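Hello,

Following up on my earlier ticket. Below are the two sequence lines again, exactly as submitted.
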Amino acid sequence: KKPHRYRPGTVALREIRRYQKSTELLIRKLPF
DNA sequence: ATCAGAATCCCGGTGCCGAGGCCGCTCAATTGGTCGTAGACAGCTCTAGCACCGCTTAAACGCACGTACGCGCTGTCCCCCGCGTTTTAACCGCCAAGGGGATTACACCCAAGA
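Thanks for your patience. The regenerated structure is below:
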C-alpha cells in the first residue's frame, strides 16, 4: 500500500488557516 | 458512488502565575477670592459672489468597416509539493596545567637570654 500523500494545495491552505487563526509571532526571537 | 487514512476539535483534569480585591497617604483635584484681557455683539462698507444675455466654435456623439488585442484551448517540461536523514544553533563533565602541609630515625649531655 502506498503511504498517504496530500496533493499540492491542501497543506498550503491548512497552514494558511492555522496561521490566520493564531496570532503568535512567526519570526524567531534570537535571530531577529 | 464508496472506504482507509492521517489530521482536527471537544472533553476529564489541573494547577499556577496572572488577574482581581483591599489599606495608608499624599499630591493632585476642589473651594473661595481677586485681576482682566480675549471673546461676544452692534455698526459701515464695498468687494466679491451670483444670475443672465450676445456672439463664437472646437468638442462630443452617431455612422462605416475591419482587426488586432482579448481570450479559450493545446503541447511541454519544470520546479516547487511533500517525505526521510541528521545537523548546526547552541547547551553541559573529565584531562594534566600548579598552590600548598609534610622531612632529614631514636635516647642522653654541655653552654647562654627573658
